[PDB]
Amino acid sequence: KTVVVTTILESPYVMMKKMLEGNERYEGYCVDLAAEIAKHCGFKYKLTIVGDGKYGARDADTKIWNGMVGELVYGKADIAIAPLTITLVREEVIDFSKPFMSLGISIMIKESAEDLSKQTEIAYGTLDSGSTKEFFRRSKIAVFDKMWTYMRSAEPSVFVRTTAEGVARVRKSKGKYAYLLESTMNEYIEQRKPCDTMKVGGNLDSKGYGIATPKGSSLGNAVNLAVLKLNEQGLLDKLKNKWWYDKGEC
Ligand SMILES: C=C(C)[C@H]1CN[C@H](C(=O)O)[C@H]1CC(=O)O
């Protein structure tokens, strides 16, 4: 009947409109994407913000998945539409549609990863949890392995808790702090006032964000075909351009 969609606040994907109720309280790339996939697939839905404010990781002790991934695995949500990075660990427990948006870990400064690894004057870090941190932690690639060893033992801490915190740290560090984040957030922030940040070098890896559903879900097939169709029509490119560039501030 009414499909339960779990999502999360992260600009410009899902934001509180700056007096409203239900789905109309929200706006952003993922809000527009949810309406488009629902329209194509022919379903009614309710957007809900994930209670724990997490994307999805499996606790090492309890082995239970938290965040949006957890909501899908334990049957609390029917679908997740947000900047949820497609990773192998998540793919083992949930299904992802083809990418609706491409990205890679990138560097934000006020070059290359190899260049950051060989130096010591500019400090660098990632979020204290998430796919970016996990990529560095489990990487068997020499340069990233070195970067991780440096980040985990750096004092004071080079890690931050939110995107906003990583961005602010870059802005106030006089070129002494580089933030490692997904290229999509990097591109978005570059077009946000005070317009003083920049992406440098190529991405460290390659992946995307995908619509997620519980394993064996009936909705899976349909949502995947919808993503392929919206992509083919150029709609996803227009939608990214709308939220990143048309609404840019620089
Ligand atoms: C915004 C957050 C915390 C998310 C977005 N995609 C990643 C994920 O799905 O884990 C996280 C960012 C990152 O790890 O750099």
Swiss-Prot record:
One of its GO terms (biological process) is cerebral cortex development. Palmitoylated. Depalmitoylated upon L-glutamate stimulation. Ubiquitinated by RNF167, leading to its degradation. The record marks R58, R137, K229 as: Interaction with the cone snail toxin Con-ikot-ikot. Detected in forebrain. Detected in dendrites of neuronal cells. Expressed in the pyramidal cell layers of CA1 and CA3 and in the granule cell layer of the dentate gyrus. Disulfide bonds join C195-C250. It is found in: Cell membrane; Postsynaptic cell membrane; Postsynaptic density membrane. The keyword Glycoprotein applies. Induction: Down-regulated in the pyramidal cell layer of CA1 in the hippocampus by global ischemia. Changing N231D: Increases rate of desensitization. GO terms for molecular function: AMPA glutamate receptor activity; amyloid-beta binding; cytoskeletal protein binding; extracellular ligand-gated monoatomic ion channel activity; extracellularly glutamate-gated ion channel activity; glutamate receptor binding; glutamate-gated calcium ion channel activity; glutamate-gated receptor activity. Keywords: Cell membrane, Disulfide bond, Glycoprotein, Ion channel, Ion transport, Ligand-gated ion channel, Lipoprotein, Membrane, Palmitate, Phosphoprotein, Postsynaptic cell membrane, Receptor, Signal, Synapse, Transmembrane, Transmembrane helix, Transport, Ubl conjugation. The keyword Lipid metabolism does not apply. L-glutamate binds at P83, T85, R90, S131, T132, E182. Residues 111-250 are extracellular. The modification Phosphoserine is found at S139, S173. GO terms for cellular component: AMPA glutamate receptor complex; asymmetric synapse; axon; cell surface; dendrite; dendrite cytoplasm; dendrite membrane; dendritic shaft. The M4 transmembrane segment mediates tetramerization and is required for cell surface expression. Ionotropic glutamate receptor that functions as a ligand-gated cation channel, gated by L-glutamate and glutamatergic agonists such as alpha-amino-3-hydroxy-5-methyl-4-isoxazolepropionic acid (AMPA), quisqualic acid, and kainic acid. L-glutamate acts as an excitatory neurotransmitter at many synapses in the central nervous system and plays an important role in fast excitatory synaptic transmission. Belongs to the glutamate-gated ion channel (TC 1.A.10.1) family. GRIA2 subfamily. Homotetramer or heterotetramer of pore-forming glutamate receptor subunits. Tetramers may be formed by the dimerization of dimers. May interact with MPP4. Forms a ternary complex with GRIP1 and CSPG4. Interacts with ATAD1 in an ATP-dependent manner. ATAD1-catalyzed ATP hydrolysis disrupts binding to ATAD1 and to GRIP1 and leads to AMPAR complex disassembly. Interacts with GRIP2. Interacts with GRIP1. Interacts with NSF via its C-terminus. Interacts with CACNG2, PICK1 and GRIP2. Interacts with GRIA1 and SYNDIG1. Part of a complex containing GRIA2, NSF and NAPA and/or NAPB. The postsynaptic actions of L-glutamate are mediated by a variety of receptors that are named according to their selective agonists. This receptor binds AMPA (quisqualate) > L-glutamate > kainate. This is Glutamate receptor 2. It comes from Rattus norvegicus. The gene is Gria2.
